[PDB]
Amino acid sequence: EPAWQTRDHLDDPVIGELRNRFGPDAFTVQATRTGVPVVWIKREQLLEVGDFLKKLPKPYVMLFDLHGMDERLRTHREGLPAADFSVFYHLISIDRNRDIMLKVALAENDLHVPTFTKLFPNANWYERETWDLFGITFDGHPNLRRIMMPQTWKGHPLRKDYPARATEFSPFELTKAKQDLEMEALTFKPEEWGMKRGTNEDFMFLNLGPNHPSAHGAFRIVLQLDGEEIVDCVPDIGYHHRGAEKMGERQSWHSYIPYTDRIEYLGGCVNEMPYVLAVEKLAGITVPDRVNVIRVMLSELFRINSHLLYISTFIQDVGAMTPVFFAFTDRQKIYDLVEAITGFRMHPAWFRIGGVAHDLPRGWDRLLREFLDWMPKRLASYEKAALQNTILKGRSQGVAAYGAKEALEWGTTGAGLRATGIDFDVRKARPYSGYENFDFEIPVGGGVSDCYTRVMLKVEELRQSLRILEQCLNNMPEGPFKADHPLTTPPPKERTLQHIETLITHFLQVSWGPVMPANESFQMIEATKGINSYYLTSDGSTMSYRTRVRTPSFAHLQQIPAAIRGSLVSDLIVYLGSIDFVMSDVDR
Amino acid sequence: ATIHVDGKEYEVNGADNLLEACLSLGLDIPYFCWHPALGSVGACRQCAVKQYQNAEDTRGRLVMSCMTPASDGTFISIDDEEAKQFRESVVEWLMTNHPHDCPVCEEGGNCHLQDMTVMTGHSFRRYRFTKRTHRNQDLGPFISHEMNRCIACYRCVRYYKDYADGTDLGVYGAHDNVYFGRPEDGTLESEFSGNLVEICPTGVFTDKTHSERYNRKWDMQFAPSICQQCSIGCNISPGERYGELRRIENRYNGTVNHYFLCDRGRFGYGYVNLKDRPRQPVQRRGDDFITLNAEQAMQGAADILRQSKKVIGIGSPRASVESNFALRELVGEENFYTGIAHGEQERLQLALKVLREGGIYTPALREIESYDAVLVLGEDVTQTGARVALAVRQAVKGKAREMAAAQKVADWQIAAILNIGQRAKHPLFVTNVDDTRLDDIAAWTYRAPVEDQARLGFAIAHALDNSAPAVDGIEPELQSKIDVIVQALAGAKKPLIISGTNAGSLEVIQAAANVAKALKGRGADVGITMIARSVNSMGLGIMGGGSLEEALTELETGRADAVVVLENDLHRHASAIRVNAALAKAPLVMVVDHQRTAIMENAHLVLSAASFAESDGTVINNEGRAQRFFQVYDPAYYDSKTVMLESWRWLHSLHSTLLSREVDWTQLDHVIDAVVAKIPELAGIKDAAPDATFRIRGQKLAREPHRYSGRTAMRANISVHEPRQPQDIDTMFTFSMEGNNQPTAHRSQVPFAWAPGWNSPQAWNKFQDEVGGKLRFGDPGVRLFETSENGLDYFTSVPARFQPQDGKWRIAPYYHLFGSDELSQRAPVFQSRMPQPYIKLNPADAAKLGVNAGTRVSFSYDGNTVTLPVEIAEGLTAGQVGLPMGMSGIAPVLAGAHLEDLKEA
Amino acid sequence: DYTLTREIVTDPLNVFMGKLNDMVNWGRKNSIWPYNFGLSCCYVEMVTSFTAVHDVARFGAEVLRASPRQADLMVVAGTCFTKMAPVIQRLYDQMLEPKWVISMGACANSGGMYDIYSVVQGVDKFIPVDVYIPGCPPRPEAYMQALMLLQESIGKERRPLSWVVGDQGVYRANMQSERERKRGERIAVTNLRTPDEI
Ligand code: SF4
Ligand code: SF4
Ligand code: SF4
Ligand code: SF4
Ligand code: FES
Ligand SMILES: [Ca+2]
């Protein structure tokens, strides 16, 4: 049985535990290609089910995702409960190495769910986004305001009846919003932001803006300060909202890949990988070994690129302005290889449904060998010159520290999670794309996640990625770069150019789109900045019915107020430098 | 019946085959040679499924689902591995000889063969040998021929010969060298040849008119519309690209036209793309023609109309119900005139009275195929109401259908039905001034003048019922033919009487009403059909008004000093000299039209109205069904200087500017509400389509496919800034892809058929409740009137027989599908298909005048000595001259008129 | 041919005043201080052009001011999100004369691939643009090429030498389009390297 086969996961012990606790008629098991047990729960039992899952002997400790779905236009809902809308909750048990998706059905008139924030504190921003884009209210939310769109926005854009395209520009509304920006500070009240006890008459409220662009993007933080100390802060995000999920409903399965590239714009093929894996699950495609090795090599090259930018920008944020020049030279060596292979630098859009766009060009191994010879001396030089400097250490060690429990309750993944001692990397826990055939280690911290431990963990991750790249260079399999499946999009170009049935398949795949049979698929990968996941719902058409992108930077930015409370503003900017986020990842 | 497909239970009709039953259930089985309207023949072998004897059977056997009845307790599997392998092998065998042609093939993106190649999963070629090749034929100006792409599915010949009764298309050769086409190069002679471009699943037969300005299906902007070229009211999907009307596709209406159009509707759309159309309001100031915008045109027209002492309005059967009503409201009911002549108005109102007061049910176009005997009186149906002629051919094949049903043959086994029937057919009797295209299947044809055809109808009615008035002076041979018709009509379970206004005779319609009444009095399930002239002839008849002669009298006497002519060239309904003199006498002529007509030279103001592609409205077809047509595209999207509005919008704004000195562009639903409030006989046009607030789960209905391309480049040469999406306040459709076109959406107006995996016209299967039936949530369009409880009295005005007077030549109308309709004859592709102008003569009359075939003779009508070449008509009765109605220079009002000094030029 | 901002006029250009105008234009075009403003991925390519492997400092354009008052050039390097459009307009209004604008990348040019509800379709909908760079992202040397194009545009503009004496109108040269300038060499291309190699 292939890994993409539709399964109900009734053999999962969590299904038997839920049946013993709540009864057989309390929930409905849905068969998916998500790889996880999908369980439809009544709305009135959601908090009970969540508490039961949190109190299991090997408990579900992290709320991985929480979002909504407009099911009104979905025609293939066989075996599913009646629902105009739905809200899903993806929960992860690291100790079990398992996960469960809970789905709550909602009628159009009764669009309210109990809040999940008492069980999982990252449900705050997840429910705010679900309210913003779908109009689903969450009862008991401390402050349920829009998080992506401005507060004076009409409608909920992820609803199926909301038009996707840009509306006509108007200078009058730009003038009005400029006036709101001008008198935003004059009419600032802490109550609408969730802040309290401000203006005591000792705290000040200070807004941060687009004044420190360290390649992360534009966003705002309003800080409540007792003198120099942060007593509370909320981040203002949505300034980088691109409507990428709505675009997922707007593009074909093939023509959405460039948009996947720009979700986390320092990641490239890393961003492409979960989307094409989830589409290949929908299509029932198993890629050959050469495709797996090529995709792993591209992912690790882009992981090294992103880590180089992250480490150098952290060093620049601390104050040492020199290593960014050399690290971008190393990024140019990576770009030499990536340009030669894919034809592009930052957004290659090179992965395909069923494979990659072209075969490897002749001479790729020379460029890979040159980069693998160039990198280690440069990395050691950066370590000795900057990361072992005691001023940088005094600026970063012990700054914005959190443990394993705080990382689990906020959905922190990647190096921030592993610096707390939790050994959870997707490439080892849930292997994908042939990562199990590579010899590499997962660096973990001592139990405490500071700025410094996160940065050094990413340095060790860079070294491990260099090891994986060495293995990719030494053992690259001979074979096809595209699968021999009819839904491989596009087909191999030479057969398209001389064979009529292949030309027909190409013609219909690039124009109307490949038809993905109606299913739900999920793919989780270890991205550059944490765990990135694609959750795709196909309604049997050539476009996605729903494209949900879970990004780790959203969770990290939500964790910011809990970790930085009681610190200084300098600690905050160092913390932002050490998070490894981009605003495109946060806002999608 | 109960079937089990892949272990799932389904309830189906046992009289259906497994292919149409499984397609009606939403299951996907690839198929080529089967069509819902043509039956099953089992040729292509694509539709293989695995049938098991019972539930406890694992072996099974491969069967053709189209040839297998969907009987009770039938166990089949579609997703069986051997069935999937065989279906892929059938696609592969078709692919061995198929040309590498998809980029340069007009079927691409709309091709059933492409869809089934992808559906079977065949994408790898292992055949390595040569491909067979064919030369192409020239098939005329409408259909392009490319025999390389043929998969030998036999759909074309089955449709063209067995369905449409065409004679000049066939299959030649044998084995893998079978050829589909004409026996030699020439134009396809069938009036329904254009349906080949949708019947053929490949790109062999393609739309040449679309091929000139070709674009793919995903790039089209579609709207549900009604064909404007005659009164039948076939549902169409016009598709536009880059501001020009590109194609007319068939829009499935299970009540009216189902799968098929006629060639006039399919190819006569070219007048929309004419470059001489008015695009802006133009005011004639002396010898100058200045261009106005909408507001100042309204202000100037309103000022001049306010200064006038009496304003009259002249409507047209070309215009919609809303436009004619808006003109009637602008000028007043007592000042409103229908644009047709007095005799045409009398015939149209008599046909209307027979339809909605005769007590006899009038069938829809699909229902015509279920009648057991047909009498056509006077109306050359193939040239005037062509789709009715196609339906009549199906009703004629009903006898073979009944004979095969007596022998327990399934209704989809079409070859067995045709073999059992042989040449047997239901009785058909056609009367005309000459031969018709229905003479090949008619049991009898009566070639006679219109008075003699009416007398034959009156005699048939009298022999059916003695209370009907008798006819004196019937010859014994004609009496024997009358008796043959009488026993054929009396023995029929469902007789159908077809007539219309195109014969130019009131007595023909009266005789048809008498025959229908006599059949109704005997307890028969009789139906009556009236063929009108134009798309909204019945709507103009229901609205009523004075004739064009009265309007010209008002203009000539000086009682009216302002005339507003709506969508009427005025020369088809009255003599051109009288019209020109009356319009020159009037100090204000305003012409609201979308075509450059001859009366615009003397017009003081010309309002650039919208054609059907750029407008919304309602039209009433020949059976009284109100149907809404929706705007296809915004004419101002590319050319921002284009001020081309709906006629009702122009006239409503003119009325508002005349009354309150303020402009009011209004909304379509407001005008429809005004129509149904003021005219109760048109109250059913409210329910022809839902209003503009209708939504499918909150979203509008999309006009263009979801893969519509070039949004940020199609207007980039004009400006790199993308314009605002055109807003549609009038209807529930949006001028974008951001809308709903799901086959399961609860609606009746479908702009185009597309489903995932079905890009061809076969997606209409997904849009239907059952395949070949109706649309899933009802066919659009409602009937204005029900059958009345009581009928009319017998018409006692039996005319005298035709007598040839010396020196006077009675004009016999000859209609042409390509040429008689005004707008379609303006289409450039129709000029090659148009017959050359002529005059038909009896051999005795031509010998008396000393002329041969081809000699040019001259005649004077209303002081216009015009010269035409003579051709000899064998079937025309002496004392008559055959003239082609509706052509250039020959108005349709000349039918039934008389000619003087007809002599050799 | 020139366009005047106070219409299409001619060249307003004594011989000493022409030399002074050339000296001022030379000093302005050789000292262009960009504003450090990051919208999206295009800004990553811009700051890549600032690094050692490209060294945009060689053109004297590396200073990268954090205040709009000290900056001469606004590079809109990224998507003009609807929430960020008032911020961009306010930052542009806070810049002082003379100021130039480079729209960098498809998003800033036209909205790019993001014809979506939350994105303004091009920064030229509300602020004027001196140089457009196609690309998604443009590579760092494309940003340097646009910098050189801006230098050529600055080197032949006419601005007042003082605000107390003379014409105060700003004259911008109607330069020949780069497409039409390069059409002769671009159409003459026949063969390119096959994509199977490095
Ligand atoms: S008929 Fe269909 S498969 Fe054949 S060339 Fe045309 S589009 Fe392609
Ligand atoms: S020409 Fe078309 S309809 Fe006729 S047999 Fe060939 S593929 Fe079928
Ligand atoms: S029969 Fe009449 S309404 Fe139908 S397609 Fe032909 S011209 Fe149009
Ligand atoms: S143009 Fe492309 S690279 Fe530049 S901001 Fe937009 S998505 Fe990013
Ligand atoms: S569709 Fe049944 S054999 Fe052709
Ligand atoms: Ca309209």
Contact B744 A75 (CB under 8 A): yes
Could you tell me whether strands B856-860 and B865-872 are parallel, antiparallel, or unpaired per DSSP bridges? Answer: antiparallel
Rg of chain B on CA atoms, in Å: 28
Contact C115 B720 (CB under 8 A): no
CA atoms within 13 Å, Cβ hemisphere of B177: 3
Kindly state whether B6 is in contact with chain A, defined as any CB-CB distance less than 8 angstroms: no
Distance from CA of A513 to the nearest CA of B (A): 9
Q: Which amino acid is residue B618, in one-letter code?
A: T
* Strand residues in A414-530 grouped as ranges (E): 519-526
* Partner residue facing A166 (CB), from C47, C53, C121: C121
Q: Count of CB atoms within 10 A of residue A94's CB?
A: 19
Specify whether the CB–CB gap between B38 and B200 falls below 8 A: no
User: Which chain A residue shows the shortest CA-CA distance from C137?
Assistant: A346
* Beta strands across the sheet bearing A85-93: A27-30, A38-41, A98-106, A85-93, A62-70
Q: How far is CA C161 from CA C30, C154, C166, in A?
A: 17, 14, 8
Tell me how far apart the alpha carbons of residues B576 and B554 are, in angstroms, rounded to a whole number: 17
Tell me how far apart the alpha carbons of residues B387 and B379 are, in angstroms, rounded to a whole number: 13
B757 alpha carbon – ligand 5 mean position (Å): 18
Q: Which amino acid is residue B369, in one-letter code?
A: E
Using an 8 Å CB-CB cutoff, list chain B residues near A499: 100, 124-125
- SS3 of B713-769: the string is CCCCCCCCCCCCCCCCCCCCEECCCCCECCCCCCCCCCCCCCECCECCHHHHHCCEC
Angle of helix A13-22 versus helix A46-54 axis, rounded to 10: 130
Distance from CA of C173 to the nearest CA of A (A): 27
- SS3 of B389-401: the string is HHHHHHHHHHHHH
Strand partners, B375: B429, B497
Tell me how far apart the alpha carbons of residues A282 and A522 are, in angstroms, rounded to a whole number: 9
* Ligand 4 closest atom vs CA C108: 1
Resolution of the experimental structure, in angstroms = 2.3
Specify whether the CB–CB gap between C138 and C102 falls below 8 A: no
Tell me how far apart the alpha carbons of residues A382 and A322 are, in angstroms, rounded to a whole number: 10
Q: Which amino acid is residue B722, in one-letter code?
A: E
Pairs of CB atoms within 8 A across A/C: 144
Contact C110 B712 (CB under 8 A): yes
Provide the token pair at A356.
């990659």
Q: Is B64 in the pocket of ligand 5 (CB under 6 A)?
A: yes
* Partner residue facing B95 (CB), from A73, A500, A540: A500
Provide the token pair at B412.
């989809």
Distance from CA of B88 to the nearest CA of A (A): 11
B232 alpha carbon – ligand 6 mean position (Å): 24
H-helix or E-strand containing C41?
Answer: helix C41-49
Distance from CA of C121 to the nearest CA of B (A): 8
Backbone φ and ψ of B658, nearest 5°: -70, -40
Provide the token pair at A531.
């765990």
Tell me how far apart the alpha carbons of residues C50 and C73 are, in angstroms, rounded to a whole number: 15
Q: Which amino acid is residue B892, in one-letter code?
A: P
Provide the token pair at A224.
């409540």
Is there a common fold for A13-139 and A244-587? no
- CA B723 remoteness from chain centre: 35
- SS3 of B464-530: the string is HCCCCCCCCCCCHHHHHHHHHHHHHHHCCCCEEEEEECCCCCHHHHHHHHHHHHHHHHCCCCCEEEE
**Residues contacting ligand 3 via CB (< 6 Å):** B 227, 229-230, 232-234, 261-262, 264-265, 385-387
Residues present in chain C in total: 198
B152 alpha carbon – ligand 1 mean position (Å): 14
User: Which chain C residue shows the shortest CA-CA distance from B711?
Assistant: C115
C80 alpha carbon – ligand 4 mean position (Å): 10
* Partner residue facing C111 (CB), from A166, A258, A266: A166
Provide the token pair at B12.
């189906």
Q: How far is CA C112 from CA A203, A584, B56, C103, in A?
A: 44, 16, 60, 12
Of the candidates A375, A389, A447, the one whose C-alpha atom is nearest the C-alpha of residue A416 is A447
Contact B711 C121 (CB under 8 A): no
Of the candidates B511, B369, B361, the one whose C-alpha atom is nearest the C-alpha of residue B428 is B369
Contact B118 A486 (CB under 8 A): yes
C139 alpha carbon – ligand 4 mean position (Å): 11
Kindly report the CA angle at C30 between C25 and C34, in degrees rounded to 5?
110
Tell me how far apart the alpha carbons of residues B513 and B528 are, in angstroms, rounded to a whole number: 8
A65 alpha carbon – ligand 2 mean position (Å): 54
What residue ranges do the domains of chain C occupy?
2-188
Tell me how far apart the alpha carbons of residues A270 and A272 are, in angstroms, rounded to a whole number: 5
* Ligand 3 closest atom vs CA B229: 7
Q: Which amino acid is residue B620, in one-letter code?
A: I
Which residue of B191, B234, B629 sits with most ligand 3 atoms within 8 Å of its CB, as the best mutation to test the pocket?
B234
Using an 8 Å CB-CB cutoff, list chain A residues near C139: 345
Q: Is B87 in the pocket of ligand 5 (CB under 6 A)?
A: no
Q: Which amino acid is residue A339, in one-letter code?
A: E
User: Which chain A residue shows the shortest CA-CA distance from C38?
Assistant: A213
Structure determined via? cryo-EM
CATH code of the domain occupying C2-188: 3.40.50.12280
Could you tell me whether strands B428-432 and B373-377 are parallel, antiparallel, or unpaired per DSSP bridges? Answer: parallel
Tell me how far apart the alpha carbons of residues B388 and B367 are, in angstroms, rounded to a whole number: 10
- Which residue's C-alpha comes closest to atom 3 of ligand 1? B114
Q: What is the largest CA-CA distance in chain A?
A: 79
Q: Is C123 in the pocket of ligand 4 (CB under 6 A)?
A: no
Backbone φ and ψ of B152, nearest 5°: 55, 50
CA atoms within 13 Å, Cβ hemisphere of B275: 0
Q: Count of CB atoms within 10 A of residue A510's CB?
A: 17
Kindly report the CA angle at A256 between A255 and A260, in degrees rounded to 5?
140
Using an 8 Å CB-CB cutoff, list chain C residues near B719: none
Tell me how far apart the alpha carbons of residues A366 and B466 are, in angstroms, rounded to a whole number: 105
CATH of the domain spanning A244-587, picked from 1.10.645.10, 1.10.10.10, 3.40.50.410, 3.30.365.10: 1.10.645.10
Backbone φ and ψ of B318, nearest 5°: -75, -35
* DSSP notation for B160-201: IIIIT--SS-EEES-GGG-EEE-SSSS----TTGGGHHHHSS
* Beta strands across the sheet bearing C8-9: C8-9, C2-5, C170-173
Tell me how far apart the alpha carbons of residues B446 and B431 are, in angstroms, rounded to a whole number: 4
Contact C52 A326 (CB under 8 A): yes
B229 alpha carbon – ligand 3 mean position (Å): 6
Helical H segments across B661-704, by residue range: 668-678
Tell me how far apart the alpha carbons of residues A156 and A131 are, in angstroms, rounded to a whole number: 8
Provide the token pair at A314.
């952290």
Provide the token pair at A310.
């992250």
Tell me how far apart the alpha carbons of residues B300 and B318 are, in angstroms, rounded to a whole number: 26
* Beta strands across the sheet bearing A203-208: A203-208, A220-226, A229-236
Q: Which CATH architecture has domain A13-139?
A: 2-Layer Sandwich (3.30)
Q: Is B200 in the pocket of ligand 2 (CB under 6 A)?
A: yes
Question: Which residue in C40, C92, C104, C110 has the most chain A C-beta atoms within 10 A of its own C-beta, making it the best mutation to test that interface?
Answer: C40
Of the candidates B31, B171, B23, B41, the one whose C-alpha atom is nearest the C-alpha of residue B90 is B31
Tell me how far apart the alpha carbons of residues B513 and C138 are, in angstroms, rounded to a whole number: 79
**Residues contacting ligand 1 via CB (< 6 Å):** A 504; B 98, 101-102, 105, 107-108, 111, 113-114, 149, 202-203
Contact C117 A211 (CB under 8 A): no
Provide the token pair at B120.
């079977």
H-helix or E-strand containing A257?
Answer: helix A257-261
Q: Which amino acid is residue B99, in one-letter code?
A: P
Which residue of B28, B29, B45 sits with most ligand 5 atoms within 8 Å of its CB, as the best mutation to test the pocket?
B45
Q: Which amino acid is residue A158, in one-letter code?
A: L
Tell me how far apart the alpha carbons of residues B356 and A468 are, in angstroms, rounded to a whole number: 85
Q: Which residues contact B558 (CB under 8 A, 6 or more apart)?
A: B585
Could you tell me whether strands B373-377 and B336-337 are parallel, antiparallel, or unpaired per DSSP bridges? Answer: unpaired
Strand partners, C7: none
Rg of chain C on CA atoms, in Å: 18
Tell me how far apart the alpha carbons of residues B435 and B814 are, in angstroms, rounded to a whole number: 10
Provide the token pair at C25.
């234009």
Strand partners, A252: A543
Question: What is the 8-class DSSP label of residue C161?
Answer: S
Which CATH topology does B808-904 take? Answer: Barwin-like endoglucanases (2.40.40)
Kindly report the CA angle at A258 between A254 and A263, in degrees rounded to 5?
125
Distance from CA of B780 to the nearest CA of C (A): 35
* Ligand 4 closest atom vs CA C42: 4
Tell me how far apart the alpha carbons of residues C110 and B720 are, in angstroms, rounded to a whole number: 8
H-helix or E-strand containing B446?
Answer: strand B444-447
Q: How far is CA A584 from CA A147, A153, A258, in A?
A: 14, 21, 14
Question: Which residue in B711, B715, B722, B724 has the most chain C C-beta atoms within 10 A of its own C-beta, making it the best mutation to test that interface?
Answer: B722
Backbone φ and ψ of B211, nearest 5°: -65, -25
Q: Which residue has the tokens 């050799």?
A: B904
* Partner residue facing C116 (CB), from A182, A246, A325: A246
Nearest listed ligand to the Cα of residue B320: 6
Q: Tell me the residues of chain B between 172 and 231 that have a Cβ less than 8 Å away from chain A.
A: 216, 218
Q: Is B45 in the pocket of ligand 5 (CB under 6 A)?
A: yes
Tell me how far apart the alpha carbons of residues A371 and A365 are, in angstroms, rounded to a whole number: 10
Tell me how far apart the alpha carbons of residues B425 and A296 are, in angstroms, rounded to a whole number: 73
Question: What is the 8-class DSSP label of residue B283?
Answer: E
* Straight-line distance from the first to the last Cα atom of chain B, in angstroms, rounded to the nearest whole number: 74
Provide the token pair at B404.
């095969």
Question: What is the 8-class DSSP label of residue B772?
Answer: T
Specify whether the CB–CB gap between B607 and B590 falls below 8 A: yes
Of the candidates A415, A467, A462, the one whose C-alpha atom is nearest the C-alpha of residue A309 is A462
B207 alpha carbon – ligand 1 mean position (Å): 14
Report the helix count and the strand count for chain C, using DSSP H and E. 6, 6
Q: Is B18 in the pocket of ligand 5 (CB under 6 A)?
A: no
Tell me how far apart the alpha carbons of residues B532 and C155 are, in angstroms, rounded to a whole number: 76
Q: Burial, B477: exposed, middle or buried (Cβ in 10 Å; 0-12, 13-18, 19+)?
A: exposed
Tell me how far apart the alpha carbons of residues A429 and A116 are, in angstroms, rounded to a whole number: 27
Strand partners, B884: B814
Could you tell me whether strands A546-550 and A137-139 are parallel, antiparallel, or unpaired per DSSP bridges? Answer: unpaired
Asked if omega into C98 is within 30° of 0 (cis), the reply is yes
Provide the token pair at B427.
């009785």
Of the candidates B577, B523, B573, B517, the one whose C-alpha atom is nearest the C-alpha of residue B549 is B573
Q: Burial, B275: exposed, middle or buried (Cβ in 10 Å; 0-12, 13-18, 19+)?
A: exposed
Question: Which residue in A487, A503, A516 has the most chain B C-beta atoms within 10 A of its own C-beta, making it the best mutation to test that interface?
Answer: A503
Contact B721 C115 (CB under 8 A): no
